[PDB]
Coordinates of C-alpha atoms (C1' of nucleotides) in Angstrom, one line a residue:
Chain A
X151 CA -58.0 69.6 130.9
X152 CA -55.3 71.7 132.7
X153 CA -52.0 70.5 134.2
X154 CA -51.7 71.2 138.0
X155 CA -48.4 71.4 140.0
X156 CA -47.3 72.8 143.4
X157 CA -44.6 75.3 144.1
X158 CA -44.1 75.6 147.9
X159 CA -46.1 74.4 150.9
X160 CA -45.4 77.1 153.5
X161 CA -45.8 76.6 157.3
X162 CA -47.5 79.6 158.9
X163 CA -48.4 79.4 162.7
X164 CA -49.6 81.8 165.3
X165 CA -49.4 81.3 169.1
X166 CA -52.4 82.1 171.4
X167 CA -52.8 81.2 175.1
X168 CA -55.1 78.4 173.9
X169 CA -52.2 76.5 172.3
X170 CA -50.3 76.3 169.0
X171 CA -52.4 76.0 165.8
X172 CA -51.6 76.3 162.1
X173 CA -53.4 77.2 158.8
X174 CA -51.3 75.8 155.9
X175 CA -50.8 77.8 152.7
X176 CA -50.0 76.5 149.1
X177 CA -49.3 78.0 145.7
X178 CA -50.7 76.1 142.7
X179 CA -50.2 77.1 139.0
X180 CA -52.4 76.0 136.1
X181 CA -51.8 75.7 132.3
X182 CA -52.5 74.1 129.0
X183 CA -49.1 74.8 127.3
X184 CA -50.8 77.0 124.6
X185 CA -50.1 80.3 126.3
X186 CA -52.4 80.6 129.4
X187 CA -51.3 80.7 133.1
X188 CA -52.8 81.6 136.5
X189 CA -51.4 81.6 140.0
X190 CA -53.5 81.0 143.1
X191 CA -52.9 81.3 146.9
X192 CA -55.2 79.5 149.3
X193 CA -55.1 79.1 153.0
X194 CA -56.9 76.3 155.1
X195 CA -56.5 74.2 158.2
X196 CA -55.2 71.0 156.4
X197 CA -52.5 70.4 153.7
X198 CA -54.9 68.8 151.2
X199 CA -57.5 71.5 151.5
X200 CA -54.9 74.2 151.0
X201 CA -53.9 72.8 147.6
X202 CA -57.6 72.4 146.6
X203 CA -58.6 76.0 147.3
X204 CA -55.5 77.3 145.5
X205 CA -56.5 75.4 142.4
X206 CA -59.9 77.0 142.2
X207 CA -58.3 80.5 142.7
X208 CA -55.8 79.6 139.9
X209 CA -58.5 79.0 137.2
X210 CA -60.2 82.3 138.2
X211 CA -57.3 84.6 137.6
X212 CA -56.7 83.6 134.0
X213 CA -54.3 85.7 131.9
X214 CA -53.3 85.1 128.3
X215 CA -49.6 85.0 127.4
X216 CA -48.9 86.6 124.0
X217 CA -45.9 84.4 123.1
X218 CA -47.3 82.2 120.2
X219 CA -44.0 82.2 118.3
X220 CA -41.2 79.6 118.0
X221 CA -41.4 78.4 121.7
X222 CA -39.8 81.6 123.1
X223 CA -40.5 85.1 124.5
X224 CA -41.1 88.2 122.3
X225 CA -38.7 90.7 124.0
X226 CA -36.7 91.7 127.1
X227 CA -38.6 92.7 130.2
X228 CA -37.6 93.7 133.8
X229 CA -40.3 94.1 136.5
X230 CA -40.1 94.7 140.2
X231 CA -42.9 93.8 142.6
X232 CA -41.9 94.9 146.1
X233 CA -38.5 93.6 147.0
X234 CA -38.4 90.8 144.4
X235 CA -37.1 91.5 140.9
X236 CA -37.1 89.0 138.0
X237 CA -35.6 89.5 134.5
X238 CA -37.0 87.6 131.5
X239 CA -35.0 87.4 128.3
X240 CA -35.7 85.6 124.9
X241 CA -33.7 82.6 123.6
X242 CA -32.8 80.5 120.5
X243 CA -34.8 77.3 119.7
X244 CA -32.3 75.1 121.5
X245 CA -32.0 76.4 125.1
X246 CA -34.0 75.0 128.0
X247 CA -36.0 76.9 130.7
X248 CA -33.1 78.0 132.8
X249 CA -35.1 79.9 135.4
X250 CA -35.8 79.8 139.1
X251 CA -37.4 77.2 141.3
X252 CA -40.6 79.3 141.4
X253 CA -40.1 80.9 138.0
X254 CA -39.7 77.6 135.9
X255 CA -43.0 76.3 137.5
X256 CA -45.0 79.1 135.8
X257 CA -43.0 79.1 132.5
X258 CA -43.5 75.4 131.6
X259 CA -47.2 76.1 131.7
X260 CA -46.9 79.3 129.5
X261 CA -45.6 77.3 126.5
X262 CA -42.1 78.9 126.6
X263 CA -39.7 76.1 126.2
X264 CA -36.7 78.4 125.5
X265 CA -36.1 81.1 128.2
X266 CA -33.3 82.5 130.4
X267 CA -33.7 84.4 133.6
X268 CA -32.2 85.6 136.9
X269 CA -33.6 85.8 140.5
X270 CA -32.7 89.2 142.0
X271 CA -33.5 90.8 145.3
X272 CA -35.7 88.7 147.6
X273 CA -35.8 84.9 147.0
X274 CA -39.3 84.4 148.4
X275 CA -41.4 81.8 146.5
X276 CA -44.6 83.9 147.0
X277 CA -43.3 87.3 145.8
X278 CA -41.2 85.8 142.9
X279 CA -44.0 83.6 141.4
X280 CA -46.3 86.6 141.2
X281 CA -43.6 89.0 139.9
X282 CA -43.3 86.8 136.8
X283 CA -47.0 87.2 136.3
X284 CA -46.7 91.0 136.2
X285 CA -43.7 90.6 133.9
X286 CA -45.7 88.3 131.5
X287 CA -48.8 90.7 131.5
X288 CA -46.7 93.6 130.1
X289 CA -45.4 91.5 127.2
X290 CA -46.0 93.0 123.7
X291 CA -45.8 91.5 120.2
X292 CA -44.9 93.2 116.8
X293 CA -48.6 93.6 115.8
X294 CA -49.9 95.0 119.1
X295 CA -47.1 97.6 119.5
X296 CA -48.3 99.4 116.3
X297 CA -52.0 99.1 117.5
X298 CA -51.1 100.5 120.9
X299 CA -49.1 103.2 119.1
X300 CA -51.2 106.0 117.7
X301 CA -49.9 106.5 114.2
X302 CA -51.1 109.6 112.1
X303 CA -53.4 109.4 109.0
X304 CA -51.8 106.8 106.8
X305 CA -53.3 105.3 103.5
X306 CA -56.4 103.3 104.3
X307 CA -56.8 99.8 102.8
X308 CA -60.2 98.0 102.0
Chain B
rU1 C1' -26.5 81.0 121.2
rG2 C1' -25.9 83.5 126.9
rG3 C1' -27.4 84.7 132.8
rA4 C1' -32.2 77.9 137.4
rG5 C1' -31.0 78.0 143.5
rA6 C1' -31.6 76.5 148.3
rG7 C1' -30.9 76.3 154.1
rU8 C1' -30.5 79.4 158.5
rU9 C1' -31.6 85.1 162.5
rC10 C1' -39.0 84.7 164.2
rG11 C1' -44.8 82.0 167.3
rA12 C1' -45.2 83.1 162.5
rU13 C1' -45.0 86.9 158.1
rC14 C1' -42.8 90.1 154.8
rC15 C1' -38.0 92.9 154.2
rU16 C1' -32.9 94.0 155.3
rG17 C1' -28.6 91.2 156.0
rG18 C1' -24.2 88.0 157.3
rC19 C1' -22.9 83.1 157.1
rU20 C1' -23.2 78.1 154.5
rC21 C1' -23.9 74.6 150.5
rA22 C1' -24.8 72.6 145.1
rG23 C1' -20.4 74.2 140.1
rG24 C1' -15.9 74.6 137.5
rA25 C1' -10.8 74.9 138.1
rU26 C1' -5.8 73.9 140.4
rG27 C1' 2.1 72.7 137.3
rA28 C1' -1.7 69.9 144.1
rA29 C1' -1.0 66.7 148.7
rC30 C1' -3.3 62.8 151.8
rG31 C1' -6.6 58.3 152.6
rC32 C1' -8.8 53.9 150.1
rU33 C1' -8.1 51.4 145.7
rG34 C1' -5.5 50.3 141.3
rG35 C1' -6.0 46.9 133.9
rC36 C1' -3.5 49.3 130.0
rG37 C1' -2.5 52.7 125.8
rG38 C1' -2.1 58.0 123.4
rC39 C1' -0.7 63.2 124.7
rA40 C1' 0.8 66.6 128.2
rU41 C1' 3.1 67.5 132.8
rG42 C1' 6.4 67.0 137.3
rC43 C1' 10.9 71.4 144.4
rU44 C1' 5.2 75.7 143.3
rU45 C1' 8.7 74.9 150.5
rA46 C1' 16.1 76.5 151.3
rA47 C1' 18.7 81.5 145.0
rC48 C1' 20.1 76.2 150.5
rA49 C1' 24.7 73.6 150.8
rC50 C1' 26.5 70.1 146.8
rA51 C1' 30.3 63.6 145.8
rU52 C1' 30.8 62.1 140.8
rG53 C1' 30.1 62.0 135.2
rC54 C1' 28.7 65.0 131.4
rA55 C1' 26.7 69.9 129.5
rA56 C1' 32.1 73.6 123.7
rG57 C1' 34.6 72.8 120.8
rU58 C1' 36.2 72.9 116.2
rC59 C1' 39.9 74.0 112.0
rG60 C1' 47.0 71.9 109.6
rG61 C1' 42.9 73.8 102.0
rA62 C1' 46.4 79.7 108.7
rC63 C1' 51.5 77.8 110.7
rG64 C1' 56.7 75.6 113.2
rG65 C1' 55.6 70.0 113.7
rG66 C1' 54.4 64.9 114.4
rA67 C1' 54.1 62.5 120.7
rA68 C1' 49.6 58.2 119.0
rG69 C1' 47.0 54.9 114.8
rU70 C1' 46.9 53.3 109.7
rG71 C1' 49.8 53.0 104.4
rG72 C1' 53.8 53.7 101.8
rU73 C1' 58.3 53.9 102.5
rG74 C1' 56.2 59.4 104.0
rU75 C1' 50.6 60.2 102.9
rU76 C1' 46.3 60.2 105.3
rU77 C1' 45.5 61.5 110.0
rC78 C1' 46.7 63.9 114.3

RNA sequence: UGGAGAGUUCGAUCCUGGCUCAGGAUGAACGCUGGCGGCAUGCUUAACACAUGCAAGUCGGACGGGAAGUGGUGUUUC
């Protein structure tokens, strides 16, 4: 029971001496609004078959988003994947999802209803939709920072 | 409590990169149209040249007076 939506249907064509043929590509993102996303890129001859294969690749690369709070992000994070750079900042329980055309499509599925961002560098829908995934994977919460951090011998509780 | 972009240079892709558009604003003009009210505002172009009227006068409890107007029969006022 996951929600499915398309980002961009790109037209990629190569010319041979045998004519002009194309293999359509589509980016589909999945989600259940509880804090679970997954992007998928699939290439096929037709438009309907390119959306189908990208939906099967989306439910395979499943990553958990550690948001769980009052419909917002835990902290500030800046990640750069290639030429594309996206900045994700937390917001108050009244702001909408003021993020990019390829960024808002992955954030509405993550459960984050309150978020503010910017689209820097390259404005390609392929490199920016995956740059937000690398930025959401490196997200830490108050409990897992202290568990990642190796504190010395403190007083042990039962 | 604050920070959404997209189109176009390729057969096509990913970069770089210029250009263009969506917004708000402006003591604005033009075109079409046009019911009022409240508040604000109005040569931003020649500090160009200007008819007319008006925009600084007021005091006689500062004086010699009294040409007008009003009383009394000489004081207001001027």
